[PDB]
Design a protein around this ligand. Sequence first.
Ligand SMILES: O=C(O)c1ccc2c(c1)nc(Nc1cccc(Cl)c1)c1ccncc12
Ligand SMILES: [Cl-]
Length: 270
Amino acid sequence: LESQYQVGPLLGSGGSVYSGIRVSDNLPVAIKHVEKDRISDWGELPNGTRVPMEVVLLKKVSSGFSGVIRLLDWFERPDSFVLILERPEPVQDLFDFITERGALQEELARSFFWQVLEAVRHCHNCGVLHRDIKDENILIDLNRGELKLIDFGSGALLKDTVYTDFDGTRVYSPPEWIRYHRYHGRSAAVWSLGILLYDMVCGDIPFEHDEEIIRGQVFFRQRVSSECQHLIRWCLALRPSDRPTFEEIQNHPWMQDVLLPQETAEIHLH
Ligand SMILES: O=C(O)c1ccc2c(c1)nc(Nc1cccc(Cl)c1)c1ccncc12
Ligand SMILES: [Cl-]
């Protein structure tokens, strides 16, 4: 009936997301609506029910692991789908967080960035490729210091062969996409993570136009340490095969002695 939930106010659109409470528990949730007409990419659930790929991917990552948003439930309507998603409270998305705090201290960027890496690796381990990693698609559970990856609407099943379709954010896409319309999932993901790390520590993204992406020359507009500059420049190698693996990123020197999430909440967030 979908009145297991009380809909509250619109939180935004880009489908459309509203705030809600589960009626049992009063558990907080996000209610996301997606029009069938606007959905390009579809899958089949284990029972072979036709659903948006978004839902397939959410169930595949679904888990006790808190670094990826939990899909609590979903409904099909004549012309739409509705997803019941987890809502942290208090919460704030990383784009707003950075917009208001500016460039982040490296300690805090390290914790954040690490948590994002752990979430992305969990996605890849569950056979899922996000394809739209960026500040707007990351939520901060302000009390626990835990980040949550959201919005699998542009995702795909992870594969080892080449992708020739892309539907995520252009300014996070890698040079191979812009000029050949071809990428591999992991290396493109590593590129976007480089953009994101640069955004964390410089307070904005490094490239606006396609010409810039393709030239891939990185200028630091803020004071960033050499270790962090190195890691970023590596993730943003032009040649996909010169990018680090996730293991090399997490073994990188800038990335050592990460804070635990709760420490992170205590020092930077409360
Ligand atoms: O898409 C998901 O997987 C997805 C999943 C969870 C949330 C979400 C998107 N979007 C939120 N906010 C939001 C705010 C403005 C515009 C839009 Cl489109 C969404 C939000 C807020 C609080 N708790 C969970 C969520
Ligand atoms: Cl530091």
